[PDB]
Design a protein around this ligand. Structure first.
Ligand code: TT6
Length: 330
């Protein structure tokens, strides 16, 4: 089997991407944030504290004839931005782009933190990291991909995120028309439960490539590109007037600047992030100071190839017995 679904930026900055997901019988379609950095499929629901729902579409398990409460199971997750959610667990039928899993754990939120409430465009998350990170207790549950994988034509999914544009998540096949050149595959460590890999280095604009190992994670659920302080300093030094602002929480730059590209290495291959992908717009409405899309990972303890990087590539998440990651230009 295969599935294919369009993924859409939630806003004009590409802060996150939503993909429609059918849950239950009859289907309840929710727009979920596919997150290769976590491993829980959780949704706003009829059980979510009413004051914490503000415009999201909710899953109502009592209206799904295939929903079954998973006895005694709860979940609770925290994300790197300080946000969180928690609740109970149903199993139900879940379909993405024509690919159907029965018995998928659907984590129904009883509580969500303010950032989720305040974002009406995201109805929940669909985790695509390794199932070892799933938070359901006392019996950990499998991700949608893990449940689907044996049925897929090939045990893979691909992320083709758009810059200010629609994109695609495919399951079970590689669309060879969706990229240029070849896909370069690189080794993955699952030791932290992530799609963790080692980039071979970077370049800033038209500058010389610096060969250096940068271990980080391919994370569709993180907006920005978080890299070591030395690398990030080298990037922003090429932007006149850019500064690291303690009050804002990272590098900012004059909105009138033209940003250089940023290149990262995948083996001998190179993925070029155009400068405008690094512009996250005014720090507050009407400001002429803009937020940068490349930020230091020093405070977070891991490098993160988030959407800024991934949307410059066609990315293969290869879930073969030994997982690998593939990157192609597009
Ligand atoms: C921080 C984080 N990192 C992940 N890999 S998920 C996640 C939680 C999250 C989900 C949606 C949005 C938006 N808009 C922002 C943060």
């Amino acid at each position: 089997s295969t599935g294919s679904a369009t993924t859409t930026p939630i806003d004009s900055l590409d802060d996150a991407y939503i993909t429609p997901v059918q849950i239950g019988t009859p289907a309840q379609t929710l727009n979920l944030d596919f997150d290769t950095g976590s491993s829980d499929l959780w949704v706003f629901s009829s059980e979510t504290t009413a004051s914490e729902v503000d415009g999201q579409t909710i899953y109502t398990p009592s209206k799904s004839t295939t929903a079954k409460l998973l006895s005694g199971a709860t979940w609770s997750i925290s994300y790197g931005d300080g946000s969180s959610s928690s609740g109970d667990v149903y199993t139900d039928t879940v379909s993405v782009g024509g690919l159907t899993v029965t018995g998928q754990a659907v984590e129904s939120a009883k509580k969500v933190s303010s950032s989720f409430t305040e974002d009406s465009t995201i109805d929940g998350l669909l985790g695509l990291a390794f199932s070892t990170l799933n938070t359901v207790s006392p019996t950990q549950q499998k991700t949608f991909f893990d449940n689907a994988k044996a049925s897929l034509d090939s045990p893979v999914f691909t992320a083709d995120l758009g810059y200010h544009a629609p994109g695609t998540y495919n399951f079970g096949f590689i669309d060879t028309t969706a990229y240029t050149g070849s896909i370069t595959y690189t080794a993955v460590s699952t030791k932290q439960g992530f799609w963790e890999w080692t980039s071979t280095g970077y370049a800033v604009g038209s500058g010389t490539f610096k060969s250096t190992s940068i271990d980080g994670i391919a994370d569709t659920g993180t907006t920005l590109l978080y890299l070591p302080a030395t690398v990030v300093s080298a990037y922003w030094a090429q932007v006149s007037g850019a500064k690291s602002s303690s009050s804002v929480g990272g590098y900012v730059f004059p909105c009138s600047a033209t940003l250089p590209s940023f290149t990262f290495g995948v083996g001998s291959a190179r993925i070029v992030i155009p400068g405008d992908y690094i512009d996250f717009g005014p720090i507050s409405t009407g400001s002429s100071s803009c937020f940068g899309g490349i930020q230091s990972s020093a405070g977070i303890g891991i490098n993160i190839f988030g959407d800024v990087a991934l949307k410059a590539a066609f990315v293969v998440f290869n879930g073969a017995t030994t997982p690998t990651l593939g990157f192609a230009s597009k």
